[PDB]
From Swiss-Prot:
The lineage of its organism: Eukaryota, Fungi, Dikarya, Ascomycota, Saccharomycotina. Component of the heterotrimeric canonical replication protein A complex (RPA). Interacts with POB3. It comes from Saccharomyces cerevisiae (strain ATCC 204508 / S288c). It comes from the Eukaryota. Belongs to the replication factor A protein 1 family. This is Replication factor A protein 1. Present with 4100 molecules/cell in log phase SD medium. The modification N-acetylserine is found at S3. It is found in: Nucleus. As part of the replication protein A (RPA/RP-A), a single-stranded DNA-binding heterotrimeric complex, may play an essential role in DNA replication, recombination and repair. Binds and stabilizes single-stranded DNA intermediates, preventing complementary DNA reannealing and recruiting different proteins involved in DNA metabolism. Binds to single-stranded sequences participating in DNA replication in addition to those mediating transcriptional repression (URS1) and activation (CAR1). Stimulates the activity of a cognate strand exchange protein (SEP1).
Length: 125
């Protein structure tokens, strides 16, 4: 069914351009974009998609929740990671809650965050 919550549109851009958000990148509402490093997934903020590494309690919930594309989550504990040498971005997620199971994708044609910052190198923290 359709997503009955609003995603945190553009928040992946905010996490890596606004220092206050970078320092505490929590509370965002995101949609799972793809799953498969069995704990590395792709998530969507409705505008961008980016890689997230699920660790600790988030890795446990990945398993217990059978997390899949379309699920909507709220991130509770997280930290940003930039691999500068490779221009790669990852959200390290230690805990999240499930908001909605198997919602229709809000955006099927989002921009990959790494691609966005590689062509706008000026913007990144």
């Amino acid at each position: 069914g359709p997503s009955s919550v609003q995603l945190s549109r553009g928040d992946f851009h905010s996490i890596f351009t606004n220092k206050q958000r970078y320092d505490n990148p929590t509370g965002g509402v995101y949609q799972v974009y793809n799953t498969r490093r069995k704990n590395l997934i792709m998530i969507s903020d409705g505008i961008y998609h980016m890689k997230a590494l699920l660790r600790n309690q988030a890795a446990s919930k990945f398993q217990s929740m059978e997390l899949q594309r379309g699920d909507i989550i709220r991130v509770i504990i997280a930290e940003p990671a930039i691999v500068r040498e490779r221009k790669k971005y990852v959200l390290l997620v230690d805990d999240f809650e499930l908001v909605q199971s198997r919602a229709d994708m809000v955006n099927q044609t989002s921009t990959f965050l790494d691609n966005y910052f590689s062509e706008h190198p000026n913007e990144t923290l």
